[PDB]
């Protein structure tokens, strides 16, 4: 696709049959989702934005389908105000900025 | 150009004859620069991100060149972790996300 930036670039993502809407975010190193109890080992982590840091759980090798594209990688879970697809997964699906 | 996302999308911008590095950030509605002096009036403003809300100074109709592409719009200045080019100016330079 080509996604313009007049509005927030929100897309539908699937994680294990739970389907949520996430922001395609070139400003984010990592991918961060709100509220979900996903499987496997997790490690505490602190991630920073405007305003300061939040504590999240880091899960590795997690499948996520983004607009029909298969992504697998590190997913952080914590009290993010919006779900965010970061560069770790944007790269996997071939996403670029173009102007 | 086309910018891939294996690394942070940091580009050189020119504002007030000053060169700075800024992050092309599709996750930001607005453009936020680290503390600097800009002319004209400004309006106090509050914005939020992953770790809450900050105070910034809002300057309107400010010219900025991003990778040579000219924009004129709103620029917020305050305690951002990094200089951030947001959707308000990304749209002006014709920037889209593509995959």
């Amino acid at each position: 696709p080509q996604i313009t930036l007049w509005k927030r670039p929100l897309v539908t993502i699937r994680i294990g049959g739970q389907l949520k809407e996430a922001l395609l975010n070139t400003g984010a190193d990592d991918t961060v989702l709100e509220e979900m109890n996903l499987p496997g080992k997790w490690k505490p982590k602190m991630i920073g934005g405007i305003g300061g840091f939040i504590k999240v759980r880091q899960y590795d090798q997690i499948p996520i389908e983004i607009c029909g594209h298969k992504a697998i990688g590190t997913v952080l879970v914590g009290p993010t105000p919006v779900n965010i697809i970061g560069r770790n997964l944007l790269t996997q699906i071939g996403c670029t900025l173009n102007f | 150009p086309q910018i891939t996302l294996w690394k942070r999308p940091l580009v050189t911008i020119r504002i007030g004859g000053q060169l700075k590095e800024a992050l092309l950030n599709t996750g930001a509605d607005d453009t936020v620069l680290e503390e600097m002096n800009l002319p004209g009036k400004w309006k106090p403003k509050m914005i939020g991100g992953i770790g809450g809300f900050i105070k910034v100074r809002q300057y309107d109709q400010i010219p900025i060149e991003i990778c040579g592409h000219k924009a004129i719009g709103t620029v917020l200045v305050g305690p951002t972790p990094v200089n951030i080019i947001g959707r308000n100016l990304l749209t002006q330079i014709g920037c889209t996300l593509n995959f």
């Binding site: 991630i47 920073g48 | 996750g27 936020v32 972790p81």
Partner: peptide, 8 residues
């Protein structure tokens, strides 16, 4: 007024 920069 929402800016989701994230430094992991």
């Amino acid at each position: 007024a929402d800016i989701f920069y994230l430094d992991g």
